[PDB]
Design a binder for these strands. Structure first.
Length: 167
RNA sequence: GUUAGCAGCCGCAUAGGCUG
């Protein structure tokens, strides 16, 4: 049994559902909601994540704290009432590694030249993921990327985005 | 199906993982 609370995207025609989902997830991340005890799941995920973001936790989920955390997005969301669920679908984030990323790390670790690395990776294409994803702007790394979500076994350990990590 | 699919770290790894 997990305590769950649901965030439904609402009245978002001007910006799009995926935009609101992206800002909700990033705001929860930036404000420290995902402290390792809170997971995230997406009940209406089919090919994108859907229009509902559900937080789940063993400890209490507080509607007041959640609303104040998202107080710059309340016009685009409806925060539901606390519930509880038996089996929650859990997710992890799959990362793609470009050829340039791999070549640069090879140069650092193997101490080889650029053309040596290009030859060693000459038949590498790059990960092309089609899973549902949420666009994320990382401040510390200065990058925008597509956070691909893959259904996983519930490890009961979660990262700063509410996604399962190995324990 | 979002105009996005990135930058890094760990690792022998173009296995896997993690950071944001």
């Amino acid at each position: 049994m997990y305590n769950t609370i649901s965030i439904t995207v609402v009245d978002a025609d001007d910006v799009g559902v995926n935009f609101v989902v992206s800002k909700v997830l990033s705001t929860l991340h930036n404000k420290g909601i995902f402290n390792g005890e809170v997971g995230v799941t997406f009940p209406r995920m089919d090919k994108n994540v859907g229009d509902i973001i559900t937080l789940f936790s063993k400890t209490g989920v507080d509607r007041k704290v959640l609303t104040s955390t998202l107080n710059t997005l309340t016009d685009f969301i409806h925060i539901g009432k606390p519930k509880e669920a038996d089996k929650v679908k859990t997710y992890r984030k799959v990362d793609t590694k470009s050829k340039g990323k791999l070549i640069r790390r090879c140069i650092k670790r193997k101490g080889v030249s650029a053309e040596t690395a290009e030859s060693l990776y000459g038949n590498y294409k790059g990960e092309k993921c089609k899973l549902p994803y949420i666009v994320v702007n990382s401040k510390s790394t200065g990058q925008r990327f597509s956070m691909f979500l893959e259904e996983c076994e519930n490890s009961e350990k979660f990262n700063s985005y509410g996604l399962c990590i190995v324990s």
